[PDB]
């Protein structure tokens, strides 16, 4: 073949993105990690997808987990392997030493199994194979130099055979050896490592394609999740800056605010509402979510602080009976503490839920509520995933944030999200004549014009009331004014 | 079979939550940890609850712990394991060594053993099996490869007998290798990790469902404790956000306050009293609890800075009679330094103290006192756990809090409980003509209206009173207001 | 028995509360540690107390140290181990190798020794046993496996004879495994790790009860102090928020100042005196320390910054004389560099000195001098130690602190010692018309009225004099006043 290397899509969401095509055909790939990174699965689901998507008969070589169970478990994702076993579209080739036997059977069986393996490829006319825990095969009695030669025997053959392989391997250090013997490493053409790194009690899964000989791939670890629908990696690094941009408008929910933005927000932008605690934000969100239920166009509300009944009561006080909203299925409300899942499972449920209610708007009440306990970056990386999907996805977005410090909050945001939104509305407390009076102002809008005036506003059983600006004050922004009361021009 | 993997219910508080159902039935679940982590308990509590909440007889294997003691120790949790074996719903398959050395019996292992076990199982209808410290068996002279096959031949047979097992291991490095030989992680079907991390000078026990082959489970490490009633895990990440929230209102205890709050505190919410030291907090607490008792409802005051005595005094000086509330069975003053337990243990002392008195009011004097010493990240999870529980039990709670800075305190909290609370009160000092004056202020009140004004707050013998506001000042929050006068 | 575990007291200062009761009866406890931690001192102290308190004899197996050696060191605490051996109350079993040369003698090992131990137990009707340095025993040629067996043999045998035991082990890394081979860790019913953390050229020994089978014990480590009285532990968490309270009051030494506090300091109260350097804290203490002698009461004043001579000095030119106090025995000045004792000691140095002279009042001149080279937490504890003691012991304790910054200290304490203290006084600077004027005021008092004003006081020959406030001035706190006309 005088042409470049040929790859093969695994149909594993996000993987074929990282691999600029996917596992190279004809060559064997090595995927390893510690006890639980998803390996077993990464192979199984590597085969399944093949069957169901191109009917490329798979051959699953075990070594420890009994064949019987490899199925019993695989039904957790809705994969009735039993079937593909009947329909000869996949052959589970048992190779796990029974409860008894003898010893000193070194390379003895390795030269045979390769005769057995070629049998299922030959017979079932296979194309994709996946040996799981090849490691427990050397877990008999062998040195490092002993491992490099038993493997190279297999891959060798399989490359002649032409089959495309995947090998499972165990590791004990998350960022250390690449496999117990640190030898398989240079016995593969491609090495992929799966990591389930701990951290402050939080578990984060990731995947990295260390090497793929003769081609390009995505360098670095990528957060993946294991769910009811198999390994799902999120190439938050992939996704291009190919976002749609319409000039159309939508109503903020406050006619007097819709003005201040030159006519509203854009059907293709991210709106950030920031302020100290109790500035309005939650109200905003609500008057944003509601304005969507108005024009009978479903939308979602993601509240991570308040709850089911607490958001009804509190909103109902401002008017807007959310009740009829859920009924006329033009608004559904999620809710759940951020501590209920890592930003990996969250980012997901976001998109996942968006794919069943088909939004038009979307409001995340408190962004700083997610950020909680998570690392700086691990968070920015979360905005992007959200701000990104909900932009190339026609979804308008409203993100609420709390500047951990009032009257003096020398910055819209604190996490540095400021530079990834299209509109910056900020609510702040102003101390006028010994009283905490609010003040909303449109800080920025890349598209439209928007008002540049700082205006106070009061909350009421009526909702937001954007009143007059502080036409006669100074240092207003700080929060601690100093009225002018200038003696005119002295007559 | 075509179904998913059905899990048995351990019956350990919260474990099931973490495991999502329980131990994969008919399968071998693992449980290793450094010594003193709990294991043996967990693997024993495994049976007892089963054999007494479902009735499934159990055969507890033991490699080192003698049967007498395995029974002697269990009397630590009030469990009579003697009985269970006096009825055939439990069997101590004593596999402990004998003080007579004797080489050659190392082979009889597994194979000859396995039969013993099963022989027992059969003689009891054993549904659950807890083999403790299987690791001390190959503590004769075995390799890493050797053990793998030794195990592969131990789980297998037990997997066959269609019985659910509990394998207990041990390790050394707290985070390092999961189980001694780095073989039990990849060889097992279920792996549980019992850690007893030092982290400072205190120790925080924690459990982790590392991996359950075939199903889902709570990823991560979760806090837990061992008490007379056994293991007690608190999955402060699996508590739903379905907090019953009504529109009722209880009275704060202070009249002028309730007005400023649009008419009082919602019986279903969490109040946060924050402010420089000396401002007032503890008072608002004492006046909070006074009320619960005036309406003859119960209330608990978890004190973390003063003794029951110094606390009763402070009250008399303010008018209310805590001395009474103690007998009129309408007040529980707990008292205990924050250093007397890891938050892990306190959350429970509280959780327990509540459902031992069903109070309508819970006061936590000085949340800061608890946070001193601990991380800010471990603090937030404690507040959340109490902020949450407190709610779910329709209980109104008042949490104190001292801001490490007096005056010019721009951020409510330096900690940032700020957003996880429903009602925020704010006391602060203000100089006015060479004199420190107190100043109350309702900051946010989610459900209702509430008064903006920042009024002067006077403390005296007759309790706390609210005077007028600093209506003619600029930068009153700055700690040093400039007096202006505008009149035609 | 159909009950819980039976525990035996050790009387080892504070251990019985950390272990909740004592060491589990008829069972062996392993006490490990790196060299110089205190193990033997723990082992001996046990048997020792077993005798002098409960007339309970004990067997002490010594694998390495010589018998006459054990006896000798023991004297460092004033314990006549020779005598207790002569009264047949304790037996030092000597399993120490011969200074000569022999490889074929201990061929019947363990089993052969056990009979001895098991003999002695009965010959001496001993109730307690402590085996010092088992490690050194098989430290010959053994694996992680050859130990677990040998030991378990001994342990079980000692369990059968119903002997409550103590096995001592060595370690290498401080927070590394619990014992040399990683097996005693589990053949033992109970685990005790003695540490010796050396953080910052300073050493701090602490004890932890890893595990006690079927019972309760405080988790984590507590710091201890080997002293002439042997092991002494302080579980600054095993203390209770249960101290006697009151309304009775006491003078401050400064009349005026007492009025601003509702009429004196409470008695059961801890007073904090913060303020920039040079604000007179030292002048309040002395005055406070002195007022206790006039009324005729015993008060202590621990120093950490000024000597004894400089103290008596400045205290003279300020009027009241400290000398007289000492003579009369109505006062006692300590003195000692913070650096010359590890807090936990100090804490104790104070406790004893307290138990010595029995004080009504105490003056800790500068907590924020002890705070030096110590961690926020390590110190936050030292405080709770003394603060919570003076209370349960009903003492009038006035402490001193220094705000690291002058005029404008946007806070009271940097280590937030407040909220633990009852009454906070506050001396600060004020720049008025090119001058450095002083300011004093009560920032909080828990059970009284106290003046809410910021007064200016003048220091001079007679002492501290408090005057009136800065009415017509703004920003008095930021240090830079703004006389507004
Ligand atoms: N339906 C599911 N939903 C969510 N998570 C699941 C589901 N099924 C399995 N998991 C998770 O994925 C893991 C499965 O890993 P798997 O058994 O496939 O192989 P491995 O971890 O790579 O290697 P090995 O388990 O043999 O050591 C489980 O440990 C669990 O955390
Ligand atoms: N019925 C009402 N009448 C008058 N004011 C109300 C009413 N309900 C709520 N408010 C006001 O609205 C604020 C509630 O906070 P809000 O709903 O704006 O959420 P937020 O500022 O976004 O977030 P956070 O929960 O952190 O404060 C209160 O501070 C209060 O002053
Ligand atoms: N009634 C009880 N209340 C509180 N804690 C207890 C009680 N009983 C025992 N404990 C604690 O639990 C621990 C007991 O652990 P356990 O002996 O059951 O198993 P393990 O430490 O996991 O493994 P192993 O002891 O076999 O090495 C002790 O360290 C002790 O502190
Ligand atoms: N009988 C009383 N009469 C007048 N004022 C009192 C009386 N008792 C207490 N006070 C005042 O109340 C305050 C006592 O502290 P308080 O009960 O308010 O708790 P806090 O300020 O929240 O916390 P902390 O006590 O730890 O400083 C003091 O500032 C004091 O001036
Ligand atoms: N009278 C004493 N006063 C203060 N410290 C003492 C006194 N006597 C001994 N010490 C200290 O106590 C320690 C004694 O340790 P000990 O002999 O008890 O056993 P160990 O250190 O646990 O084990 P090993 O000595 O066998 O290595 C010494 O390191 C020393 O610093
Ligand atoms: N005899 C004196 N006459 C007048 N003023 C004095 C006299 N002695 C000291 N002072 C004043 O008191 C201050 C001394 O402070 P003092 O010795 O009381 O302790 P401190 O300021 O609390 O702590 P530190 O000495 O560690 O700074 C000096 O700054 C000075 O202005
Ligand atoms: Mg696997
Ligand atoms: Mg909110
Ligand atoms: Mg145990
Ligand atoms: Mg065990
Ligand atoms: Mg306070
Ligand atoms: Mg207080
Ligand atoms: Mg909010
Ligand atoms: Mg010694
Ligand atoms: Mg000083
Ligand atoms: Mg001084």
Numbering used by the authors:
A (entry chain B): 14 to 504
B (entry chain C): 14 to 501
C (entry chain D): 14 to 498
What sentences appear in the manuscript?
The circadian clock of the cyanobacterium Synechococcus elongatus can be reconstituted in vitro by three proteins, KaiA, KaiB and KaiC. Two phosphorylation sites (P-sites), T432 and S431 that are both located in the CII half were identified in KaiC.
To analyze the phosphorylation patterns of KaiC P-site mutants and to visualize potential conformational variations in the vicinity of bound ATP and residues 432 and 431 at hexamer subunit interfaces, we determined crystal structures of the S. elongatus KaiC single mutants T432A (TSa), S431A (TaT), S431D (TdT), and T426N (nST) and the double mutants T426A/T432A (aSa) and S431A/T432E (Tae). b KaiC mutations xyz or mutants KaiCxyz are sequentially shown in order of sites x = 426, y = 431, and z = 432 where the wild-type residue is in upper case and mutated residues are shown in lower case, i.e. Tsa or KaiCTSa, where the residue at position 426 is T, the residue at position 431 is S, and the residue at position 432 is mutated to A. The structures of the TdT, nST and aSa mutants provide further support for the conclusion that T432 is the principal phosphorylation site because it lies closest to the γ-phosphate. Moreover, the hampered ability of KaiB to antagonize KaiA with the KaiCaST and KaiCnST mutants could be due to their altered electrostatic surface potentials relative to wt-KaiC as a result of the lack of a phosphorylatable residue at position 426. The combined structural data expose subtle changes in the orientations of the H423-I433 loop region harboring phosphorylated residues relative to the γ-phosphate of ATP compared with the structure of wt-KaiC.
